[PDB]
Design a protein around this ligand. Sequence first.
Ligand SMILES: [K+]
Ligand SMILES: [K+]
Ligand SMILES: [K+]
Ligand SMILES: [K+]
Ligand SMILES: [K+]
Ligand SMILES: [K+]
Ligand SMILES: [K+]
Ligand SMILES: [K+]
Ligand SMILES: [K+]
Ligand SMILES: [K+]
Ligand SMILES: [K+]
Ligand SMILES: [K+]
Ligand SMILES: [K+]
Ligand SMILES: [K+]
Ligand SMILES: [Mg+2]
Ligand SMILES: [Mg+2]
Ligand SMILES: [Mg+2]
Ligand SMILES: [Mg+2]
Lengths: 126, 101, 50, 45, 147, 126, 186, 142
Amino acid sequence: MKYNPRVSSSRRKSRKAHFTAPSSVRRVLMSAPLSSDLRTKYNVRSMPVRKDDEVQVVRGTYKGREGKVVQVYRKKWVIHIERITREKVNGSTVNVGIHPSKVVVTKLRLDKDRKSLLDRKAKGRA
Amino acid sequence: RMFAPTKIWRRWHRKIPVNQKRYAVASAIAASAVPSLVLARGHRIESVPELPLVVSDSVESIEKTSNAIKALKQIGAYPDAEKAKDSHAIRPGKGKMRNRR
Amino acid sequence: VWTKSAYEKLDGIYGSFDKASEKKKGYVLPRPKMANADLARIINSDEVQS
Amino acid sequence: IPTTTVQSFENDMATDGAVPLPAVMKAPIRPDVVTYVHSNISKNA
Amino acid sequence: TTRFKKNRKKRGHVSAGHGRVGKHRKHPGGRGNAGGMHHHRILFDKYHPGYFGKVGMRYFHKLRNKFHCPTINIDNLWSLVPQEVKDKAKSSNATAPFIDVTQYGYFKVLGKGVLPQNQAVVVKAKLISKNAEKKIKEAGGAVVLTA
Amino acid sequence: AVPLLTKKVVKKRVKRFIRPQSDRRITVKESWRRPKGIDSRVRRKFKGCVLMPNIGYGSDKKTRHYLPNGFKKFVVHNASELEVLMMHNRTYCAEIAHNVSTRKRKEIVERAAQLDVVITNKLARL
Amino acid sequence: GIDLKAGGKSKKTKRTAPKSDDVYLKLLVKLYRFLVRRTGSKFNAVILKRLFMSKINKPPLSLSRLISYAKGKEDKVVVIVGTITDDVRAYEVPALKVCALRFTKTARARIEKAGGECLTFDQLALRAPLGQNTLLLRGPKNAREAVKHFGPAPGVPHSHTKPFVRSKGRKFERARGRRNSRGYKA
Amino acid sequence: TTVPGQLVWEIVKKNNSFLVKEFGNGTAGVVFSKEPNNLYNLHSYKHSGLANKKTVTIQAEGKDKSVLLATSKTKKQNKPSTLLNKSVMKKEFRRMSKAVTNQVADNYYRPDLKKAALARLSAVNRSLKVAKSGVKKKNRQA
RNA sequence: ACGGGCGAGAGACCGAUAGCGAACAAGUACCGCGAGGGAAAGAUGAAAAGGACUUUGAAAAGAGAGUCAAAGAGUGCUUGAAAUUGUCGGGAGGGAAGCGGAUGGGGGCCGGCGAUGCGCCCCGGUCGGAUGUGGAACGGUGACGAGCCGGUCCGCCGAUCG
RNA sequence: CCCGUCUUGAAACACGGACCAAGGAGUCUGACAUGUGUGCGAGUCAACGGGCGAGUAAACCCGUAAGGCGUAAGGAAGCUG
RNA sequence: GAUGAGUAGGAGGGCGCGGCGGUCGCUGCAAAACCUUGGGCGCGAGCCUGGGCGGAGCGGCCGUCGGUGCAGAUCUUGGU
Ligand SMILES: [K+]
Ligand SMILES: [K+]
Ligand SMILES: [K+]
Ligand SMILES: [K+]
Ligand SMILES: [K+]
Ligand SMILES: [K+]
Ligand SMILES: [K+]
Ligand SMILES: [K+]
Ligand SMILES: [K+]
Ligand SMILES: [K+]
Ligand SMILES: [K+]
Ligand SMILES: [K+]
Ligand SMILES: [K+]
Ligand SMILES: [K+]
Ligand SMILES: [Mg+2]
Ligand SMILES: [Mg+2]
Ligand SMILES: [Mg+2]
Ligand SMILES: [Mg+2]
């Protein structure tokens, strides 16, 4: 049960906040869980999805497909993966949007900030 | 404009005498001790050792929800809680969009 | 489900028919219009059936 | 006076209950009064 | 409770119970107490005699506190005595209970009813009626004046 | 199941009581309404006009609400509600509610066949 | 056709059951329905009829009036279908056997202290199934404020009906129609 | 019924979780009761499983023509877990009928519902038999 | 105290003719010389995967074909009532039609529309069989004691029935 | 004989009504009154306010010589009761 | 056993709509809504149900509440 007086349980307000979120907030909202191996290694559960991250889809028609993320379309709330595509009536190839909550991160692109965030997340879990 | 537009100074509240409130509370407490009435109100009490159900004061020191569940199972009141949990559902009608989902 | 302490406090809270309550000033539990609601015991008693 | 048994948990050591039946447990049960009061006071929120 | 309103029972009856001929118009007899002397004279006279005119003297800036004077009858004096004091008075005939009716918020003692039989009572009050004093004296008590 | 009813079902009237002029104006529905007009010939009961319902048409109490098969209807929404008729199978028949799925309808039908309870619409959704 | 008023049907309405939803009152009504049916006692019939009546038709009886009416009949069980209230004007309370629908706390305390008993109507049936050796009493039905306003209109001759006034004083309905010096009197 | 059954009936006859009503409150109204200790599933003081200290329960046990005959214990009304004296009969219909009679009427437990108990036992036995071997006749000939 | 300003939390309130006039580039389009007046207008799909290509046509488009779970979802795209209209099929019609009651002709629909069981015997197959003797738990009454009475289940000797 | 309406009297040469969908009219509040249900009873009313409390607009508790109504009336009034 | 007319008007018992406190249920093995010379119940308000369509919710019962029931108003808006 919510107790903080500065947070609202209103459905309308929560929906408005989610659908008007700026890019910086959308990045956090577009988080995905880490794989079992990565979760065990880093002691972290979920991370924001990045461009060059390796991802395995776990839901939908592409449940077995995996690859490298190639675009994070925050405006559309979807990511794009290397070979997860389809053919139009024209015959050309287009990427299929996949929601990050429905995929699993198998390999992270590590930098100084990424390592700092991983350490910060692991510290709280202890 | 609607006919007879609604106004805030409608008599929303009621002032019931304290003695009648206490009468109602006593009646409800007495009814809670009748197993037939408790069953008739929809509670699954077929496994409770007896009514009124009085438990040791050590339950007041429980801190974890798992221990609370274990106590409920021990006293035979768990099936009612399980029934309550299983009935969780979305409210039909317009009330589901009025923050009562 | 009553804890033992609350069940014990019930007597001091709601008093009884004879004496008054400590927590409710001057309150006494109400009495029903019927002393014994077992209608069969009254209708089939020796006094009535005679 | 009737006596009510106190249920004992595994953790507790004593099974001493024997709490006298409170007088309020034998109060009159009046569905009409309860319904009237409940319906009236539920308006107050 | 809208569902119990009789207009609900009148849905589909055209006139809503106010008649086809007479109808329900805005103010067929005027507003409020209009016509108290002309076309509502019979009602005023038969149900509200004395309504019109003025009697008596005026009293500018009249304060009710200076007229405050609660009264208690002698038949209610005994109820003021606590139970233990009543028992003591019954046991001992050589003394009488001393009731200060002013401490209970009474100024004047009136003389309705009777006192307990063969019971002397000493009453102190701001005022007393002649009959109340006579009854107290007959009972064997006394009256004390205070302020 | 042998119905307990023995008296023959007699209907004082089998025609509907159609609202006056509902044949004339589309906006006037068939559901009965008693005319209240001052001049209404139907209200005045002029011969050769639309008939008005009255308590005199009431059905005999012994055969009232009885279906042509000789049983009375009871709507059942699941197999659990079916057992209520176990001791009343000679007077009451079960009709499965219109919204019950075919899967549950099969279970209800099987249970009723076990209980010798007549189902009025046992072929629905089959 | 038949020359009858309303087709020979009755046009009078009387209570046939309590309007109250009190379950205990309903049980008492069942008890006395059985008693009336299987005994044919006039006392039981009166009790049953009074059990149906409304609040204003079951007025309370004061303790002092009860003592006055029970004078010389203390051995009989006094029965009232209503409430019994205490009276601070009554000093000596004898031992009385009293049956009523309800007792006030003070009245019950005084009756029990005096050595009497307070009985319910089920206990009365157990004691007096036919009402034998009872004193059936009623409270003052017409002793209420609403009754004062009933009767002839205040403004007609020989009428002492109380009028409906928002306040009491010289300026409130005392001038014309109430005095010979202002128009007419009465 | 820790309080007298008549009061319980006065309370629950208006409403309870086991009450099933259909077709409104007019002439079409149909009423039934769901409580397992109601032999005829009828909403009446006689058969009520909530407003009677002594009640009869007859239902089919899980397996093997086992019929559960249970009666509420008169001195254990305040103990729901041990309120029912359960007896599981696996013998022929004749022995089951004899046992039901002995436990219902011969001991003056609830003689007024001996016929209801026997009819309920017969219905349960027939239902079990049909459930085992399936339907073999329509039972429509009068 | 607080129908303005900035920032929050709630509701037995309304749900696109409702709710502020305004859920939308609404005090907008538009009207008036002017003060002012003042609308209508929300919904493809999970994802555009928004219909390649063939053929007829001047073209809009049609006929095929393709996408999708679905086009019976094809960008004013969830669903799609009535008034009103076209087509096919049945029927009727000497200056209205419609309607109440009773039959009939034709059509449409209905198998709880309408049963095949029951009793007594013979043969065969399965399952159990005392008022006897032990065990397990338990009940009615009594006083949630004694005593009396009693059913369910399990194992045995007889009985040889159901 | 076409409904609705006003009317002594409507099928009217009396008025409204071409047709369909949606919307559409005895309500809320204050003062009284009878009736009925409920609580208490010579009393009754804690919600002005205070203590708290579902971490809480609820529920619960609190009347010191508080206050309202009732418990005494009649007089213009002094005043008596 | 007797009896049955009803405008204005009064009252009783019921039908129907949308919420709230409870309770019992249904639903992608297809909810609501809508459609139908399918069928049935009730004197009636209405109700239950077959079939179709639709593609995501809905209902029964006990209390309680309300912006709760249309043929008319040269009624309003839209459509024809
Ligand atoms: K009227
Ligand atoms: K009229
Ligand atoms: K003057
Ligand atoms: K029509
Ligand atoms: K009639
Ligand atoms: K608008
Ligand atoms: K679609
Ligand atoms: K007119
Ligand atoms: K005209
Ligand atoms: K006071
Ligand atoms: K004078
Ligand atoms: K519900
Ligand atoms: K249908
Ligand atoms: K409702
Ligand atoms: Mg008039
Ligand atoms: Mg059409
Ligand atoms: Mg005071
Ligand atoms: Mg509303």
